[model samples]
Target: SKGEELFTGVVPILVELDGDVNGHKFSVSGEGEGDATYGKLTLKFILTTGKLPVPWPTLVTTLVQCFSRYPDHMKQHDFFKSAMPEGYVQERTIFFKDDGNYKTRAEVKFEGDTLVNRIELKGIDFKEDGNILGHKLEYNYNCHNVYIMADKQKNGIKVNFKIRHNIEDGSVQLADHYQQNTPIGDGPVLLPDNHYLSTQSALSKDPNEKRDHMVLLEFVTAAGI
Candidate 1:
């Protein structure tokens, strides 16, 4: 543990944004290393569209707010409840091996909007000289509101208010075992990000071949039989 850098709170890192979005050859970038108690975050976006579709600040804020809305993305409600067992509702995570791939099961209940979302992720393992390495990463995110912009509008888009990491009691824990696999260690298996949402595989459309016929049979039996 000696010589290893550890901070009591979140480590402030420099976030740089540079690109063309407004169809113009313009660039704007800024940096902020917030105080030791907080990490400063910044975002600068260029919009080239003729009609101001959405201002950069408002767009970013909306995206972040939508991030916590898990129900909008799923096809069916109660998906997480059906996947998890009874009496456990807040969160559930599991790791296992399936189809020669080491996978993870993650589920969490969104408190603000009152919804539960569950997802399966294959491990992202790293390898060395014909052997699995020390750490296998899956995903990482922060619960801190690094940046705060309230009632401020820069471009034509008007932003009512913005508060990140508004949860007050949030802290950052880095270089911990949280990065590595929880239930299992590293292996030779890994999957690309968003692999679970891929549509490359052939879908089984009524693999049982009884979708329509079964419904017709139920109708015939219920009325006569």
Candidate 2:
């Protein structure tokens, strides 16, 4: 029941991250799909750091966090400048870790969906960081997922549907162990398993590692439609 509730109510919020960042005037539109459900989210960002007439480095890095490239954009446009350290581009970084506990300012909950006969909820913790700009900041977690029965297998579910990403996409990867060794998703403690892939990646030696990567995942048999 613990994992069941998490897959449905908590996964959507994270899955929304990719779409939200890409679908906006500031960024390009992006979309993804899995199982039977289709989902999308967009983002609009403004630089919160740097001073008036902010330098190119500040602007470019801010946008890079949402997009994929900061250096290329900086070189193409005079508006884009880089105050990157002596050698680094100073872009946003996401890492993974093997921690047993996940803490956050928000809480996760699950409720049944009468129409889809799945589950629903609000206020799921998709991303949380306490240190930002020297202040204890926390990202607001909010999103939704719709799931259906998986038809592939009899004993297990087919991951009917959910809004999320995998390694193939630009999204980061998870780990392959337990809370003590396996990481849920991208974090500082979770290092990339591969180096050739410019994008982030994860590995799941076990079942929970697979589930920890989403904002939500639905198991159909719990309450058959």
Candidate 3:
């Protein structure tokens, strides 16, 4: 029932990540066979993050180097397994983890015609002064989702997503709605003009210089793990 409800009318689509930074425009696009499984979905990303002409060659090289230089040791871990079927690109990342305090694990897999990205966060505990300082402080749970659809012509994809974080016995709100994006399409048509997504920043308080460290993952394509 879940699969049927989630994948009904699904088809091939393109997912694009477009946003602006300090007045500069940037975007990346990915293509996949939209359905109920992601095992055979292959997506490629194009970089357009510079000035007018967009230093494409350099960006490609940089992207290659980044992937090539990924620590072999890290790749050996099961966390780096791919979800796509043979011939499809697959990647996994730590996503988030602290000195044994908090961590989030993400795994991508293909089920039938659907791309299933599973994210889990457990064993998260709050500590201070090098200890579980306060008895009332703890990390509960957090979850997110991104829904994308094929444009009417099946050429592009539209994105709509949200993040829900639930924390308890702690300082933060019991349930926090950190992020959400405007939905892009009505039925099956997802076009560039109708959808977009991007990363966000939040203030972090600490003794050292306070700054943003990519608190949430801006995701595209929908439902849940």
Judged by TM-score, which candidate is best? 3
TM-score of each model, in listed order: 0.19, 0.16, 0.24
Stretches > 4 Å off in candidate 3: 1-10, 37-41, 49-177, 180-225
Q: Give the lDDT ranking, best first.
A: 3, 1, 2
lDDT, residue 218, model 2: 19
Q: Which stretches of candidate 2 lie over 4 Å from their true place?
A: 1-41, 47-51, 55-58, 63-188, 196-225
Worst 10 residues of 1 by lDDT: 215-224
| Model 2 lDDT, residue 99, Cα | 12
* Candidate 3 C-alpha lDDT tens digits along 22-70: 2345554444443222212223434434332221211111110001111
**Per-residue C-alpha lDDT of model 1 across residues 1-225, encoded as one tens digit per residue:** 110112123322222222222232222222222111121222222222232221132112111111111122331211212221111111112111110112223333233322222332232332232111211221122222211111113111111211221112343212211111111212211111120110011111234543211000000000000
Q: In what order do the candidates fall by TM-score, top score first? A: 3, 1, 2
Write down the TM-score for model 3: 0.24
Name model 1 segments beyond 4 Å from true. 1-12, 35-56, 59-225
Give the per-residue Cα lDDT of candidate 3 at 219: 19
- Clashes counted in candidate 1 amount to 6
- Which ten-residue region of model 3 has the weakest summed lDDT? 61-70
